[PDB]
Symmetry: D2
């Protein structure tokens, strides 16, 4: 349990063109770190910026302090699922779902990803994104369900940023104690990749906190 | 060509639960009318309001006057595709794509539909929708591509309305003459259905115009 | 008893990107024809440094032609009158909030208007005055928690072609209990017929008609 | 040369749902500690019929503690000063637009503030005064077309539990050419420490610190 495995498959489409990606990786749930290797199995070479997928490729790998209820770790071995809409400032929209289950010492994700209305001359279809900036998600309860909101941005090639609003709903398969309003800091990073992003090495890191004291 | 057939399959998911629906119907492209019969093949009985699907189940069945360029009819026999995001006022989001091709005298649609973040206590998951109100879409060109925007609403069971914003991108497979800014009036209606909407008879009607003279 | 010819008098005070201005207007309209016109004069803050078109839809649904079979919330509200509040969200993030308190003095409607726009970028069509006109639009009216609302997504045509979209969300509040209408539409067509060079003087016309949509 | 102790003086004029009000304030802050406090007095339109919390984040990033390795746009802008514009979009559709023109007179910052909120529903937490406080927040600052912007999605906690979300979009404009910063964050914590019953008098505190996010 201090060190775990991940294997995943994402099937989806962007602007109506389908693709599928599989990933293997591992992380340290108490340290709030994870890493993975993904390879495109269908729809390659991908005609859109890979960065729109990386935040879809699991909060159980977040470091939670003692004084904040950890909804995600407490959700296992049964697991949880999440749904997310990602609204980019030029009207591109990505909807994603992930069902996270646990197999002994391996989390397996079934992921669906669907993006529409990305303009041909925009940074996503023209692959002008560089990386996601570090972000701060706010988590809160709404009608007995845990939600997460974060407004973040991608840095662009010629400088400047491309904004996106995330709205996530988290659903444990069993009743879990709900946390108070709190935050989770994120840093997601693609360390290595081949020319057309057929191979991607992705690292993410996060920690929950309670904001300015 | 005055009277045509339609056959379609939609595969999708709502809040992560997958389903699939097939439809047969026919319409009169110059009269701006269409009708169809759909049956759920997978994921039934559907746990969400059927109304969120009906506007996804083809502008070629719109009556265009002489003085407005008809992008959609002019797009055949090669056809066109469209992408759409549907943003409901409580945060539920549906992304849809449709690739419309022509087989002799039959249009066939390949449809993908993905909705996320519909709350359990909302009108969609609680099936408290009645029908779509009549609507007026505005069509305009953006960077050489035809777009359509319409903000409409579903009537609810106890009275009141549930709003949704549509953003559609239309892409002909071949270069087609682009129209000027214009409007398309819509009325979509489910005439008949069985208890759990396994069977649905759907009718739609539309006409392009140029607004108040 | 609304008359076929009524008068309009108005004062708008406002600001765009923090720069204040004020405009006064006098006009006339035909409530049963759904038509109105007015002459507007900049009294403070001229010459206006932003596109005049962002103001024109703020310069009264009582001048919309309602058929007999649709409840007319606006004509019912007089002689006491009504007020409305509106936010206008432009696609580049410029936001305008406006309010109008409408009273009646004889055969003259009087408007007290506040207008505040923020976050219009210096290189955008509003601050660079690259707007041409509003396209015709279709507003949707509906009731929310006993209050009448109006929504419309429309657009301004631009100098070099193309359009600049805006979403309006309006709340209408009668000053007495009036019968509420069912869901319906109001088509709009607004036009600046003439103006002087710096838009210190503007002659504005509007045409509006209610309907029930595609039959 | 910003000092460790500076003074604040302000006047806000505004309206919510068309009802006007005005508030004057005097305060103090510690720019190198990222802390400030002020006493606010309602001068017109009292007793305010809306939740005071919608105003508090409008009542100056110069009082944010900036580390040496992040360019401080706000301290650089003085003595000439800077202005900002902001829209605040609440999840039930209430929208507030605000502007602040900040100048410096000796060791005292002077604010000229306009505030205009519309479309707050009668049964919502703002008009029913069911807000408790702002949660701590993290604003993201970035440059857009040579102009500094700030975005934050945050929330008010409510009387009966739960939260009421709001999205802020702010534009910051220095009154002279200053060096622009890279993408960074400012954490905020704002609190009403005391007030009289009808909020005619309010003592408000804010704490802010810039950082570069998760390392």
């Amino acid at each position: 349990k201090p060190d775990m495995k991940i294997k995943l498959r994402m099937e989806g489409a962007v602007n109506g063109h389908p693709f599928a990606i599989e990933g293997v990786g591992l992380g340290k749930p108490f340290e709030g770190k994870q890493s993975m290797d993904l390879k495109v199995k269908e729809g390659g070479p991908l005609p859109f910026a890979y960065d729109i997928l990386t935040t879809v490729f699991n909060m159980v790998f977040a470091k939670y302090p003692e004084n904040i209820v950890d909804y995600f770790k407490q959700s296992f071995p049964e697991g949880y699922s999440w749904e997310r809409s990602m609204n980019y400032e030029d009207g591109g929209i990505c909807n994603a779902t992930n069902d996270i289950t646990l197999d002994g010492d391996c989390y397996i994700y079934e992921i669906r990803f669907d993006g529409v209305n990305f303009p041909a001359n925009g940074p996503v279809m023209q692959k002008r994104t560089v990386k996601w900036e570090p972000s701060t998600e706010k988590l809160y309860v709404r009608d007995g369900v845990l939600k997460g909101d974060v407004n973040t941005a991608l840095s662009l090639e010629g400088g400047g940023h491309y904004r996106c609003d995330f709205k996530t709903t988290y659903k444990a398969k069993k009743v879990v104690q709900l946390p108070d309003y709190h935050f989770v800091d994120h840093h997601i990073e693609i360390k290595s990749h081949d020319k057309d992003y057929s191979n991607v090495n992705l690292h993410e890191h996060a920690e929950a906190h309670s904001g300015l004291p």
